[PDB]
Design a protein around this ligand. Structure first.
Ligand SMILES: *C(=O)/C=C/c1ccc(O)cc1
Length: 125
């Protein structure tokens, strides 16, 4: 277990040091996206929540391919505003329901420390 709390003020500083293997030790789901929504990282906790195989979704587009239920003003719309603004920090509840049992989650999106990367953090509620 990597000891980082969901919603920590400086989470993007803490996660900047972690390889794929360390990300898999987190207590919550973590996805790293580029500015276009392509998945750069996807940890084991997230695969446990959603059923997706982490290695097979890297390189796919989260909003177009993997998670079409997030293609809406309430999720994707907030992401694209943050990318265009260069700043993003928002937390909200959502239901994941594509090809899965509908699962309610808390979502935290935050701009990463590195240039053109954005974190999506997920935990059950
Ligand atoms: C809605 O289609 C959500 C799908 C989804 C959310 C999060 C993931 O990690 C994978 C699929």
């Amino acid at each position: 277990m990597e000891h980082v709390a969901f919603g920590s003020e400086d989470i993007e500083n803490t996660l900047a040091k972690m390889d794929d293997g360390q990300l898999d030790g987190l207590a919550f789901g973590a996805i790293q996206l580029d500015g276009d929504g392509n998945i750069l990282q996807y940890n084991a906790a997230e695969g446990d929540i959603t059923g997706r195989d982490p290695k097979q979704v890297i390189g796919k587009n989260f909003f177009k391919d993997v998670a079409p239920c997030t293609d809406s003003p309430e999720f994707y719309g907030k992401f694209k505003e943050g990318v265009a603004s260069g700043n993003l920090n928002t937390m909200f509840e959502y239901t994941f329901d594509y090809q899965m049992t509908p699962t309610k989650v808390k979502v935290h999106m935050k701009k990463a420390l590195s240039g053109d990367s954005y974190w999506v953090f997920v935990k059950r509620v």
